[PDB]
């Protein structure tokens, strides 16, 4: 979120906008290295919700 004065010089209003833009219109992939000296914190996240018991004792009603 960014607060900035209206683009047109005639409009004297100060406005609030939401940003979904980048420094490059067609984003490029960067290749870099992270050293242990940078106080690195490693933790695992889950994007998609899928189940955790890999083995299933399935029962079928007679």
Partner 1 sequence: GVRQYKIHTNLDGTDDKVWDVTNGKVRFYQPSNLGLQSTNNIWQSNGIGVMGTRSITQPQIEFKLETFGESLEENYQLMKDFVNDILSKKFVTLEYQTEIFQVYADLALADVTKTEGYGKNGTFSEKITFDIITKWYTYENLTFDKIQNGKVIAGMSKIYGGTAPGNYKYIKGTSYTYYGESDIDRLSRWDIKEEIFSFMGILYPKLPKTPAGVRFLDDIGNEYTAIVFKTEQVQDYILINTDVNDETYQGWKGTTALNLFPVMDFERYRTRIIEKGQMELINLSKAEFKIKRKADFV
- Per CB under 8 A, residues contacting partner 1 are 4-5, 14, 31-33, 35-37, 39
Closer residue to partner 1 (CB): 29 or 33: 33
Distance of closest approach, residue 58 Cβ to partner 1, in angstroms: 45
Q: Which is nearer to partner 1, 33 or 50 (CB)?
A: 33
- The whole-angstrom separation of Cα 12 and Cα 5 is 7
> What is 14-56 written as a DSSP string?
EEEE-----SSSS---------GGGT-------SS---S--S-
* Smallest distance from partner 1 to CB 34, Å: 9
């Amino acid at each position: 979120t960014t607060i900035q004065h209206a683009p047109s010089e005639t409009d004297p209003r100060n406005l609030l906008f939401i940003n979904f833009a980048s420094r490059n219109w067609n984003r490029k992939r960067i290749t870099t290295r992270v050293d242990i000296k940078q106080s690195v914190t490693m933790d695992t996240e889950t994007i998609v919700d899928r189940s955790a018991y890999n083995f299933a004792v399935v029962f079928v009603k007679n």
